[PDB]
Design a protein around this ligand. Structure first.
Ligand SMILES: COc1ccc(-c2nc([C@@H]3O[C@H](CO)[C@@H](O)[C@H](O)[C@H]3O)n[nH]2)cc1
Ligand SMILES: COc1ccc(-c2nc([C@@H]3O[C@H](CO)[C@@H](O)[C@H](O)[C@H]3O)n[nH]2)cc1
Ligand SMILES: *Cc1c(COP(=O)(O)O)cnc(C)c1O
Ligand SMILES: *Cc1c(COP(=O)(O)O)cnc(C)c1O
Lengths: 810, 810
């Protein structure tokens, strides 16, 4: 049907049909009389998987023969989502599979909906890792993603009585056709024990052993026949583990719990032993695998020429002392040489400045679990501080600030300090964030070693986030400028020459309208709710956190409601306000915010005076597959974090690419988006970073805003008095008390500017031609935010490898 | 090469090679340059599996269309062993696969050795279930085996310093290509809770739910294109289970532990809650599956016409009250009608008279775990005892003896009594055993309902236990009488006409010699030990238990050793005495017996005066795959249980079929073997059951035998004084004390007759022609001991179905 989905040749379609029927019979052991839609999904997934394997084998063979520098991307999170459609897109099989399944009496879109998300991440950080793997494959880099194969990913969210309930995400229940277990490359990982000092070096002895079993998942590049590997480790007990008899076997679960479940905190550090075990587990297994591959290419001088290790935040920071341990204790390198190799191999990406998100591990935990690593950390620290003292003689407070070891009631190791000391490059994830790192939390380190500090602004893959989720938009773009933009997103600039083209304006608006209709029907089918698809779709989807300011959005929604009730017969631009996202299970305020959003909905959606002019919907179970549906349907993207808090954001970029306008603060990558599109094509409001600093110096007093803004006072009085919770009048007192007395994120300080800016949004929406022209200017300038651009910069400026768009032979 | 392995046609071999290469590439994602022997095994297993699937689908379809009476064989144990070779034998693919792999540069016998045993049983009871599944498929019965998919089967045995050590049997580590998960037919199983009485019936409420997920394994019949199903349940927690957050997810292991591990006790009852959970789990899931299939054929009068449930001992006895629960509480049948249906549906096989093996569950356990089942059991008991009281008025002691409820400090439910009350047929497993049931432990029940009591003598499948393990013997038989005997083992009687045939005598002895050479080399390769293959191979392999009297064998071995040392220059027939088997981990005396056997070996095998005239070998890790190697190599089969203790035995039958002579007591099926072969062709010794009873009446005094038999006194003095344990002189005092003062199995009472009978064995072995003639007379009369005969009797006399040797279309 549409060109960007590829060719459906007679031979190809005939062969797909044959192989589908072969898998249904031989692989699934079903016939057509008893097959369910799930069986049909698996038959198609195996059929498509077969097309990957030849390319996967040949790619890995090619890397063995050419021996390029290898890139290892270490992350505790990979938020992959579904694989079937992405695989078809990257192999140019989508139209062929559509036609094949159509001829078998099946709807391929219905089969796609059966696949579980691989939800092995919390949000942005994990999804960035996934976009990066796609870009690395598309750019022909010899890259490997290494992580943990969690049995349970991010929990499934249910809303009961307006409250979040959590259910385990049993994503492996029906099997995962995309992974290949490799039990033959299983490796041992050590814990506990003690250190003995012999005459020739330290020895780590009396340890408990857990096995790391790898599962490999293919990562196809975009139409280049490159298939890279994501290797995820699963924990297994050895067979003599604890070996009355029955209890010893049952106790194997203690070892296997390491890979059982993803910690569900976004931007928050929980210092639990189990999490530390996960961090070491992934590092120890991965580093053995790296060294094995390096020796099968004595001379570790060449190691940094053949290996780059990228640390996705501090979560895999133990890679630094582990590499030192292996090189010094096992390979018998002198300390100075081992350190040179380590620093040249490792690079660190920081993703947050929030103090509660930074990993600071208690020394007593490390002492018990990883006694040799603690010794190595202390030695790193002493050598590092000796350098500081030589550069800044007499500056004793600098020595305290820069130490890897923090003093206090409980001594802690600051893992960010460890990463900076042990890495040749340290980057933030958007220009403003990288500047904040140099001016504030890592200022001292920047003064010592300015050359280490870089910026790499984040991006998103346009395969998943345009072609896959919004084929209608991809097609109308391709009709004008061809298909090359899918792997060279800067070509979207050519669309600026179509900003006054009446046919293009029409087509852009038509695609948005279709996407809104399709989403409005999805909502009715799966969740029994009636929305007006002519209304402005105002969307805020992301994890629930105080810094992201869903509460500010709530205040605007109540303002609109109160304005309608005051003047019911005045025209207002109709809106559907959709908010979705998961709260971390232990984060009380985030759970209270969810309840507030649903309680506002309960009032607003049932008030007959409001009608269809305002609807408030909480989108349940926000995840990658839901993002693919709602983002193409959005008109307005809410990116309203307090300036200085959102390191980058990536949702922001997904909305820009898909034809929504953005209302946002000058935070993270929003700054760069506005710069690319022009400030006149962005709805910017609120305090800049400098304004927040000025408020913090005099002292934030929320009472001043309450006293001066009557519309704001009315809302607080409604919240306090039980207007949105008549049966439990004090339900929201924690929210009110926080806003009035200990709001770290200054919700009231941006309220007035936010409401005024929202009125400008509504004014523009009344003129559909000018709204759409502004949209075209956004889509046209979104090219910088391709993760292909981001990865090319990492490759050239950090890893020292050249990207390639050349195809391997098929 | 050999005819019974089938045809190797050019087309077949070409297609096998293609499919092997397809699986290596697409299924395993390997090329020939990096493939290991394990990859080659999996490629062949998938290739052979593909030949099963069409037949499996068509067989199950045929049962749906014809709607025959269905047979459900419920067992906690299925000791399957390896599947690859058995599959090839039953599909006539062995020579074709041999040729295909040969042309690919691979040795198929080497690939076969890579497969793990499916070790989901302890010994005879579990292996009987496996032979039965093979026979049911070969006889065209619509039969299903139902059990538990244990993650860990019977432990792997290691010998360290002469002691048994246990290691977990992680049989699923590399995957199981033979099973198909069916997560779509997952069913709930309930535990705990309480009973509420409403106006219309009892309700079992407030229960904890565990899911039962089925995995299906194909069971091919012998060259008839029938493929039946073995369905094994695995335990899964529901997704809301216990739903801080992290701990709730980790605690899912509590539910999933139900299917984690096989209880490793042979002939011993351990009354643990976890075992009770396993028993109910298998019953509750299976019965729902049975009822579903019955309703998809209101009218439960027809249920016993369409369903037979065979209880493999009392382990699945909760099927009786569960069926009553479903019919009364859920289907709303009146009690009397439900009971009629239950009795007509269920039949019970008893496999032991040892009092410590009989299941007697504490009432307090049932009350907490299965409160509704306990109520139903009490009602069954009251109704049953009302019948007893009407038949035997005033016989109050009979009421006490027959009750399902045993009085005492702890009230217990006698599950054997429950099975008899609720079953239309009760059988023992050999003629002597079935007679013992009627005369002793179930005498009262037999007097009430004589019509219920039957015998079904055990058997073994001649596919695994002749064709598969001893192709050389199968072939020389086939050269004379054709191939029909493989599915009609009574045809072996035709071999009596070849007892004086010089060529046949030669060939039988040649095959034995080859098997001994092959086993002698296996021992050198895998376990670094030098045995004389011209020696008589004297073999006792079976679980270690006091009743099986490995200790009596030990006493004979020491006797031979002492006789050699007394007269070193006299000729004695050389022997290699091999003993193997696992001890239950908590069974102290069994572990001490293993240590005694290895300690005897340590002395005997290193005494230079003995030379190669006597060797004592402990065969480590005895299991089904080791049985397939050692049984074809044996000359003498040791079947020496105290009369009245071995309900049947099946090892005995395996040795008879494979050309060993038997030294044995008149116990279990040995009685029937001697009757079939003639007593003159069997080495019978020792007390009969009647002699044991006479000794028990006067009192067994072991001291009398010590005082009268100088050779026996010498052995006890050697054991006591530390001759076999010089560094730990008192090591064997528990063994000595047991033999002298509390030997329940009367080892000393059979010593003299046993040693004299062993001298007759040695005398016959000196005349190889007459030894071999006696062997032919044994093999020729082994036909009764086919499990095809056993299953045909169950079918006709218990299940009410007619067996069929007709082929389904291919
Ligand atoms: C399990 O514990 C944690 C899980 C995640 C984070 C984390 N997530 C991000 C997000 O990273 C994105 C990708 O760079 C940014 O776009 C986003 O601004 C940031 O909040 N920063 N930090 C921190 C601890
Ligand atoms: C896990 O707990 C148990 C496991 C097994 C048994 C058992 N095994 C047999 C053996 O059954 C064989 C098949 O009928 C007989 O040949 C054998 O004589 C008997 O001991 N009888 N009883 C009992 C409890
Ligand atoms: C992109 C994405 C995120 C990150 O969104 P932000 O608005 O940048 O926080 C979180 N979750 C999912 C499922 C995503 O696809
Ligand atoms: C046949 C068999 C048994 C039963 O042997 P008995 O001598 O009858 O106890 C036990 N274990 C294995 C592995 C078997 O094959």
């Amino acid at each position: 049907q549409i060109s960007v989905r590829g060719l459906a040749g007679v031979e190809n379609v005939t062969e797909l049909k044959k192989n589908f029927n072969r898998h249904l019979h031989f692989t699934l052991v079903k016939d057509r009389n008893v097959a369910t839609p799930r069986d049909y999904y698996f038959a198609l997934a195996h059929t498509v998987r077969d097309h990957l394997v030849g390319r996967w084998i040949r790619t890995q063979q090619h890397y063995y023969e050419k021996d390029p520098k290898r890139i290892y991307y270490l992350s505790l999170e990979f938020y992959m989502g579904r694989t079937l459609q992405n695989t078809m897109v990257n192999l140019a099989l989508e139209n062929a599979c559509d036609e094949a399944t159509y001829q078998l009496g099946l709807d391929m879109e219905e089969l796609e909906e059966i696949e579980e998300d691989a939800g092995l991440g919390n949000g942005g950080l994990g999804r960035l890792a996934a976009c990066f793997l796609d870009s690395m494959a598309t750019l022909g880099l010899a890259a490997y993603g290494y992580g943990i194969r969690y049995e349970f990913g991010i929990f499934n969210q249910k809303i009961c009585g307006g409250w979040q309930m959590e259910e385990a995400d049993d994503w492996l229940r029906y099997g995962n056709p995309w992974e290949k277990a490799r039990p033959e490359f299983t490796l041992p990982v050590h814990f506990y024990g003690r250190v003995e000092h012999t005459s020739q070096g330290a020895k780590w002895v009396d340890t408990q052993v857990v096995l790391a079993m790898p599962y490999d998942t293919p990562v196809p590049g975009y139409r280049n026949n490159v298939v890279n590997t994501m290797r995820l480790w699963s924990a297994k007990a050895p067979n003599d583990f604890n070996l009355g008899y029955i209890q010893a076997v049952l106790d194997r679960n203690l070892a296997e719990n390491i890979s059982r479940v993803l910690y569900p905190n976004d931007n928050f550090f929980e210092g639990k032993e189990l999490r530390l075990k996960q961090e070491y587990f992934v590092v120890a297994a991965t580093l053995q695998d790296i060294i094995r591959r390096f020796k099968s290419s004595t001379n570790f001088d060449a190691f940094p020429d053949k290996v780059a290790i990228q640390l996705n935040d501090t979560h895999p920071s133990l890679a630094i002392p582990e590499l030192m341990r292996v090189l010094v204790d096992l390979e018998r390198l002198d300390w100075d040489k081992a350190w040179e190799v380590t620093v040249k191999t490792c690079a660190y990406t920081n993703h947050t400045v929030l103090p509660e998100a930074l990993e600071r591990w208690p020394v007593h935990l490390l002492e018990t679990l990883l006694p040799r690593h603690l010794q190595i950390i202390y030695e790193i620290n002493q050598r590092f501080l000796n350098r500081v003292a030589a550069a800044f003689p007499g500056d004793v407070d600098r020595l305290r600030r820069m130490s890897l070891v923090e003093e206090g009631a409980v001594k802690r190791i600051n893992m960010a300090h460890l990463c900076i000391a042990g890495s040749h490059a340290v980057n933030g994830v958007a220009r403003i964030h990288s500047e904040i790192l140099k001016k504030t939390i890592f200022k001292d380190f920047y003064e010592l070693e300015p050359h280490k500090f870089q910026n790499k602004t984040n991006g998103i893959t346009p395969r998943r986030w345009l072609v896959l989720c919004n084929p209608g938009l991809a097609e109308i773009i391709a009709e004008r400028i061809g298909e090359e933009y899918i792997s060279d997103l800067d070509q979207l600039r050519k669309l600026l020459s179509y900003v006054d083209d009446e046919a293009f304006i029409r087509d852009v608006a038509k695609v948005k309208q279709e996407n809104k209709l399709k989403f409005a029907a999805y909502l009715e089918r799966e969740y029994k709710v009636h929305i007006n698809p002519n209304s402005l779709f105002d969307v805020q989807v992301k994890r629930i956190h105080e810094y992201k300011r869903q509460l500010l959005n709530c205040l605007h929604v109540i303002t609109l409601y109160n304005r309608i009730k005051k003047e019911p017969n005045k025209f207002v631009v109709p809106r559907t306000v959709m908010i979705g996202g998961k709260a971390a299970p232990g984060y009380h305020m985030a759970k209270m915010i969810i309840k507030l959003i649903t309680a506002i909905g309960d009032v607003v959606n049932h008030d007959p005076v409001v009608g269809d002019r305002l609807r408030v919907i909480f989108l349940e179970n926000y995840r990658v597959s839901l993002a693919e549906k709602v983002i193409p349907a959005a008109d307005l993207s809410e990116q309203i974090s307090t300036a200085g808090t959102e390191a980058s954001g990536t949702g922001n970029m997904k909305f820009m690419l898909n034809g929504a306008l953005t209302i946002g603060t000058m935070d993270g990558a929003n700054v760069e988006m506005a710069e690319e599109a022009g400030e006149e094509n962005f709805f910017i409001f609120g305090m800049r970073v400098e304004d927040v600093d000025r408020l913090d110096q005099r002292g934030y007093n929320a009472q001043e805003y309450y006293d001066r803004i009557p519309e704001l006072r009315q809302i607080i009085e409604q919240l306090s008095s039980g207007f949105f919770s008549p049966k439990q009048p004090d339900l929201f007192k924690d929210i009110v008390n926080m806003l009035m007395h200990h709001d770290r994120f200054k919700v009231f300080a941006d309220y007035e500017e936010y409401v005024k800016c929202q009125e400008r949004v509504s004014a523009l929406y009344k003129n559909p031609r000018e709204w759409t022209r502004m949209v075209i200017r956004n889509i046209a300038t979104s090219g910088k935010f391709s993760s292909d651009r981001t990865i090319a910069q990492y490759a050239r400026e950090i890893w020292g490898v050249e990207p390639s768009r050349q195809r391997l032979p098929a």
